[PDB]
Amino acid sequence: HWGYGKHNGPEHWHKDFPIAKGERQSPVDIDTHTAKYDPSLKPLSVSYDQATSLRILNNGHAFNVEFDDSQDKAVLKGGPLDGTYRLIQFHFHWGSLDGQGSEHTVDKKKYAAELHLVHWNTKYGDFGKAVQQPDGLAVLGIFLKVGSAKPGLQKVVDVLDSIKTKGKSADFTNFDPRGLLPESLDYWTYPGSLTTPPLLECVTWIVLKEPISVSSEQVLKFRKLNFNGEGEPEELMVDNWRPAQPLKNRQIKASFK
Ligand SMILES: NS(=O)(=O)c1ccc(NC(=O)NCCCCO)cc1
Ligand SMILES: NS(=O)(=O)c1ccc(NC(=O)NCCCCO)cc1
Ligand SMILES: [Zn+2]
Incomplete structure (x- = not known):
């Protein structure tokens, strides 16, 4: 099926998923000078105090830390959003080298990795219905650069040995996603x-x-994780990022100047 190799990587996806060439594809390059400041954008409201992480899963393309999304326990509101969006999972995309790995780019700069905190709009009842809607999801994307350690990431890092291969899951309770946030919540936004x-x-x-x-x-x-299942030939889970796609008829808005 699809993946990130030579024969099934992002340039091949359109053959099974023709929306790959669509009008609002992600990621994109964020040209910081042509993004427009929008003073009507509200600050983001991140309410993660009651988050309930449940497990961590290697799905063959990344690893997802999954949350209980059956109540408004960890929600994103405000910003460009109307209504309440519930956190369902987070995952990352990363490179084989520190010089690449992010999906979004900032003035063409690639970061070493990118965290995606995935939320779905509660007016659609569950994630499966939300993905069928133009305003169904809100993904909070956070860039990772290599420098000092992030203490709040270490519990994630330490469990990865237990989910090395595709399909492996591990209990992963009591993880606080607030330990993965930067100091500022200034943001860019686009559909x-x-x-x-x-x-x-x-x-x-x-x-x-x-x-x-x-x-x-x-x-x-x-980078020690595997795309493959146990007992299959080992292929390191690296460069699991899609490159920037055409912005087409879209404007990126900034919450800051
Ligand atoms: N459009 S897509 O989802 O990226 C895609 C690409 C390749 C394939 N299939 C494929 O490569 N099959 C042959 C595998 C031989 C490697 O052992 C399936 C889907
Ligand atoms: N990298 S991303 O844009 O944050 C992202 C987030 C969730 C998902 N989830 C997903 O595809 N789930 C499969 C079942 C719903 C799609 O029919 C995929 C990509
Ligand atoms: Zn992602």
């Missing part, structure tokens, strides 16, 4: 898509200006 098949055009993207810094050892541990 886009899932960045993996099925590439559905259902996402309000909210990309934070301020990256978090993680240590070289932390991101090295991401």
Whole structure:
């Protein structure tokens, strides 16, 4: 099926997912000078105090930390959003080298990795219905650069040995996603898509200006994961990012000047 190799990578996805060539595909390059400041944008409201993480899963393309989304326990509101969006999972995209790995770029700059905190609009009842709607999801994207360690990431890093291969899951309770946030919640926003098949055009993207810094050892541990299942030939889970797609008829808005 689809993946990030030579024969199934992003340039091939359109053959099974023709929306790959659609009008609101993600990620994009964020040209910071042509983004328009919008004073009518509200600050983001991140309410993660009651978040309930449940488990961590290697799905063969990344690893997802999954949350209980059966109540308004961890929600995103405000910003460009109307209504309440519930956190369902977070995951990352990263590179084989510190010089690449992010999906969004900032004036063509690639970061070492990118965190996606995935939320769905509660007016649609569940994630499966939300992805069928143009305003169904809100993904908070946070860039990772290599520098000092991020202490709040370490519990993620340490469990990865237990989910090395595709299909492996592990209990992962009591993780606080607030430990992954930068100091500032200044953001860019634009309408886009899932960045993996099925590439559905259902996402309000909210990309934070301020990256978090993680240590070289932390991101090295991401690169020890496998795309393959256990007992299959080993292919390191690296470069699981889609490159920037045409902005087409879209304007990126900034919450800041
Ligand atoms: N459009 S897509 O989803 O990126 C895609 C690309 C390749 C394939 N299939 C494929 O490569 N099959 C042959 C695998 C031989 C490697 O052992 C399926 C889907
Ligand atoms: N990288 S991203 O744009 O934040 C993203 C988030 C969730 C998903 N989830 C997903 O595809 N789930 C499969 C079932 C719903 C799609 O029919 C995919 C990509
Ligand atoms: Zn993602």
